[PDB]
A paper describes a structure:
[name] contains multiple copies of chemotaxis response regulator (VcCheY1–VcCheY4) whose functions are elusive yet. Autophosphorylated CheA then donates phosphate to the response regulator CheY. Phosphorylated CheY interacts with the flagellar motor protein [name] and influence the direction of flagellar rotation from counter clock wise (CCW) to clock wise (CW). As expected, both VcCheY3 and VcCheY4 possess (β/α)5 fold typical of the response regulators.
VcCheY4 was crystallized in two different states; one is in free state with no ligand attached (VcCheY4free) and another with a sulfate and a Ca2+ ion bound at the active site (VcCheY4sulf). A Ca2+ ion is located at the active site of VcCheY4sulf which coordinates with D9, D52 and main chain carbonyl oxygen of N54 with an average coordination distance of 2.4 Å. A tetrahedral positive electron density was observed in the active-site pocket of VcCheY4sulf during refinement which was interpreted as a sulfate ion because VcCheY4 was crystallized using ammonium sulfate as precipitant. Since VcCheY4sulf was crystallized at pH 4.0, at this pH D52 might be protonated allowing the sulfate ion to come to its close vicinity. T82 and K104, which are well known to stabilize the phosphoryl group in the other reported CheY structures, stabilize the sulfate ion in VcCheY4sulf through hydrogen bonding. A movement of about 2 Å towards the active site occurs for T82 along with the β4α4 loop. Interestingly, in VcCheY4sulf, an additional hydrogen is generated between T82 and K89 (K89 corresponds to Q97 of VcCheY3) which might further contribute to the compactness of α4 in VcCheY4sulf. In VcCheY4sulf part of the β4α4 loop is stabilized and adopts a helical structure effectively extending the length of α4 and overall, the VcCheY4sulf structure seems to be more compact compared to VcCheY4free. The crucial residue at β5 that acquires ‘in’ position upon activation is a Trp (W101) in case of VcCheY4 and in both the structures of VcCheY4 the side chain of W101 acquired ‘in’ position. Considering the compactness of the VcCheY4sulf structure having a shorter β4α4 loop with low B-factors, long α4 helix, movement of T82 and β4α4 loop to stabilize the sulfate ion and additional hydrogen bond between T82 and K89, it can be said that VcCheY4 has a strong tendency to be phosphorylated in the presence of a divalent metal ion and the phosphorylated state is more stable compared to its free state.
Author numbering: -1, 1 to 119
Amino acid sequence: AMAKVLAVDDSISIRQMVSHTLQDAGYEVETAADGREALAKAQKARFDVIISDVNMPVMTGFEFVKAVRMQSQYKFTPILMLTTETSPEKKQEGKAVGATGWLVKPFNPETLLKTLQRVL
Ligand SMILES: [Ca+2]
């Protein structure tokens, strides 16, 4: 009954860090290199929380969140936006798509863990 996390970020390093930090903590973690892969993974497995980088090469975190929120099982699933630069503006966009919270890059393991707990 481990909480399932889907972490989306094109960065291999970020994906490894999040996956490593979270799995070591005790989460079941799947990562996706992009929004399309993330959406495919989200449709076959039931994630309890989704972490999405804001700026990715193809599908942005906002469009990914907008899309995943269309999947009925993710109508209310907590979603955390990951980014190096939050802005009053980005946070508004995050509200129009349904984002739940924000995580600032770079994060140390501790902050990542406490942030997930607040939405879970
Ligand atoms: Ca990125």
